[PDB]
Amino acid sequence: LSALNPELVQAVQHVVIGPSSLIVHFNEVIGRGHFGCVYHGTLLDNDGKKIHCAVKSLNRITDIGEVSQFLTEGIIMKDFSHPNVLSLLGICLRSEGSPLVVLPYMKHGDLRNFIRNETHNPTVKDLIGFGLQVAKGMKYLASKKFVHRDLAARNCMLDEKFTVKVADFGLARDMYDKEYYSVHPVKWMALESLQTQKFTTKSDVWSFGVLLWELMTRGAPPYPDVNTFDITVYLLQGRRLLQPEYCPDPLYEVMLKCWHPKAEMRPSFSELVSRISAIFSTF
Ligand SMILES: O=c1[nH]ccc2c1ccn2Cc1ccccc1
């Protein structure tokens, strides 16, 4: 680590968690395998408050060029903070072992598994509230010109107060990468992204519309009968996800606006917050 550029070391200092500030519980995983090797940890703040965190070791980082790029990603993501976006608590640069990413612990795991869980019974109002929270998190990301590229219910998380956090971006990416011993998002993508492999805030709006559909169906898979290959033709014919049984008509109108074939015709996330907040307030 002494081979690191000193001005970059100075720049990342405010993101770095010293080893005496963090107690990593490498003996216990969070999500019992659902998220791979993500560990419980305890972070000590400056007042000695104990903070429950999720810790991941980044084994793909093997050389000093990759460590330096990682430091930079930490610097950038530390400036992203919003009630509905997963925050970065910090990073660890270890003398012994791969670097660590430290995030806030999410008591209720991912939003898709939460809504699919038969034991949980969120109301239509609660489901719309989750959608509004995601819209607020994306309004924040879009306001900083950050394009998510993989928005879906599986990629959002829930804390102990049931606050939704948009996740799976920056150092929280690769949320479901699992390591196997012997084994080797087209249905959320905007039509133009399927065609050009380019992503924008307007393609995140399309994905948000599919996430809204997931919320109102309590986590049903979209287009279950359509092969991923055939999705482009299906959308070009003007076919779209149908209105879920318990979805209010003005909310389905919002979903349809998200899937307009012309990206410029789709609402902005600011407009989505405006429209969904008014719908939410009728319940
Ligand atoms: O309780 C949690 N809080 C925040 C993130 C998170 C969990 C569980 C899995 N994950 C995903 C992830 C963790 C670390 C690094 C990268 C991705």
UniProtKB/Swiss-Prot annotation:
Receptor tyrosine kinase that transduces signals from the extracellular matrix into the cytoplasm by binding to hepatocyte growth factor/HGF ligand. Regulates many physiological processes including proliferation, scattering, morphogenesis and survival. Ligand binding at the cell surface induces autophosphorylation of MET on its intracellular domain that provides docking sites for downstream signaling molecules. Following activation by ligand, interacts with the PI3-kinase subunit PIK3R1, PLCG1, SRC, GRB2, STAT3 or the adapter GAB1. (Microbial infection) Acts as a receptor for Listeria monocytogenes internalin InlB, mediating entry of the pathogen into cells. Residues 24-283 form the Protein kinase domain. Coiled coil: none annotated. One of its GO terms (cellular component) is plasma membrane. Changing residue 176 to H: In RCCP; somatic mutation. It is linked to Activation of MET after rearrangement with the TPR gene produces an oncogenic protein. Dephosphorylated by PTPN1 and PTPN2. Changing residue 134 to L: In RCCP; germline mutation. One of its GO terms (molecular function) is identical protein binding. It comes from the Eukaryota. Changing residue 181 to F: Complete loss of kinase activity. Alters interaction with PTPN1 and PTPN2. Loss of interaction with PTPN1 and PTPN2. Heterodimer made of an alpha chain (50 kDa) and a beta chain (145 kDa) which are disulfide linked. Binds PLXNB1. Interacts when phosphorylated with downstream effectors including STAT3, PIK3R1, SRC, PCLG1, GRB2 and GAB1. Interacts with SPSB1, SPSB2 and SPSB4. Interacts with INPP5D/SHIP1. Interacts with RANBP9 and RANBP10, as well as SPSB1, SPSB2, SPSB3 and SPSB4. SPSB1 binding occurs in the presence and in the absence of HGF, however HGF treatment has a positive effect on this interaction. ATP binds at residues 30-38, 56. Changing residue 176 to D: In RCCP; constitutive autophosphorylation; causes malignant transformation in cell lines. The modification Phosphotyrosine is found at residues 176, 180-181. The modification Phosphothreonine is found at residue 228. Belongs to the protein kinase superfamily. Tyr protein kinase family. Changing residue 176 to C: In RCCP; germline mutation. Changing residue 174 to H: In RCCP; somatic mutation. The active site is at residue 150. It comes from Homo sapiens. This is Hepatocyte growth factor receptor. Residues 259-283 are annotated as: Interaction with MUC20. Keywords: ATP-binding, Chromosomal rearrangement, Deafness, Disease variant, Disulfide bond, Glycoprotein, Kinase, Membrane, Non-syndromic deafness, Nucleotide-binding, Phosphoprotein, Proto-oncogene, Receptor, Repeat, Secreted, Signal, Transferase, Transmembrane, Transmembrane helix, Tyrosine-protein kinase, Ubl conjugation.
